[PDB]
Amino acid sequence: PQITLWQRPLVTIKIGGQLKEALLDTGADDTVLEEMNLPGRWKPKMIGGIGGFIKVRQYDQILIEICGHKAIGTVLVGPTPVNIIGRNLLTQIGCTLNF
């Protein structure tokens, strides 16, 4: 599909059987979701954006479904204000920026 940017580019994602809303963020290197439970072991990590840094938990090889497209990659979980789908997963679904 082609997403215009008059409004925030929010889409529905499926992860861990749960359905959620998330923002397609080309400015985010990684993907970070609000506090939730995921399987496997995790690694602590600090990520910084506008405003400073936050502590998140890193999970690897997590399967996410974005608008029907399956994608695999690292998923961070932490006190983020909104769910964010970063570049690490946007590339997997063939997402691009077009002027």
Footprint on this chain of ligand BEB (rule: CB under 6 A): 23, 25, 27-30, 32, 47-50, 81-82, 84, 86
Residue with smaller CB distance to a copy of itself, 43 or 69 = 69
63-70 contacts, C-beta under 8 A, 24 or more apart: 63/15, 64/13, 64/14, 64/15, 64/31, 64/89, 65/13, 65/14, 65/15, 66/11, 66/13, 66/22, 66/93, 67/1, 67/11, 67/12, 67/13, 67/93, 69/93, 69/94
CA atoms of 25 and 87, how far apart (whole Å) = 7
- Build a one-symbol-per-residue string for 2-41: x at contacts with a copy of itself by CB under 8 A, - elsewhere: xxxxx-xx-------------xxxxxxx--x---------
Q: Identify residues 75-94 at the interface with a copy of itself (CB under 8 A).
A: 80-81, 84, 87, 90-91, 93-94
98: contact with a copy of itself by CB under 8 A: yes
74: contact with a copy of itself by CB under 8 A: no
Determine whether 29 is an active site residue: no
Residues annotated catalytic, as ranges: 25
